[PDB]
């Protein structure tokens, strides 16, 4: 589809079978999601944002569907203000920016 | 133009007779600049996300060069790690995200 961006682009993004809001953001390298229960062992990482760096667990290899198209990769979770799809998982669903 | 998300999209801008680079942010509701001076009044805000808050300078209706489409619009100027554009401005020059 093609997203205006009047609004914050949020979409339904649905892991683990469970729906849920998160925002379509290019200016996030990785894919942030909010506190949540996923699958198998996780990696330490650090993500730098706005106010300073924080850590966050590492999911590699992890299915979610994002406005119904499915992708499969690396899934952070920590704090964060949004669920937040980033360029990893934009890229494979085939997201662009265009003017 | 098409814009591949494979690495963080950045492009030049010109603002107050300065170029700078900026990245295209669908996940920024305001653009927001690194340290630097812009004519008019401003108010105080504070902005977060990932890693906390910081306190930036509003200044409202500034002409900004985005590849080469002249945008009027918000521009917060503050500590930020990088320059974001945010949906204020690419609304403006019609950036639309697209799957
Ligand atoms: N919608 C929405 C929304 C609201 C609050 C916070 C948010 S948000 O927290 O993702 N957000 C927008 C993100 O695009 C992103 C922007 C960024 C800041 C510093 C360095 C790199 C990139 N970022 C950090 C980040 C990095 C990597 C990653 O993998 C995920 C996230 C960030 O700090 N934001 C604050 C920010 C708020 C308001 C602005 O105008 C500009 C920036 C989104």
Chains 1, 2 share one sequence.
């Not at 682009?9 to 925002?23: F, N, R, S, W």
């Not at 850590?55 to 119904?68: A, F, H, N, S």
Request: aromatic share 6%; hydrophobic share 40%.
């Amino acid at each position: 589809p093609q997203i205006t961006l009047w609004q914050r682009p949020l979409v339904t993004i649905k892991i683990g079978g469970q729906l849920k809001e998160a925002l379509l953001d290019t200016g996030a390298d990785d894919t942030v999601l909010e506190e949540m229960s996923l699958p198998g062992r996780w990696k330490p990482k650090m993500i730098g944002g706005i106010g300073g760096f924080i850590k966050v667990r590492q999911y590699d290899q992890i299915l979610i569907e994002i406005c119904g198209h499915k992708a499969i990769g690396t899934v952070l979770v920590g704090p964060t203000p949004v669920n937040i799809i980033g360029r990893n998982l934009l890229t494979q669903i085939g997201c662009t920016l265009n003017f």
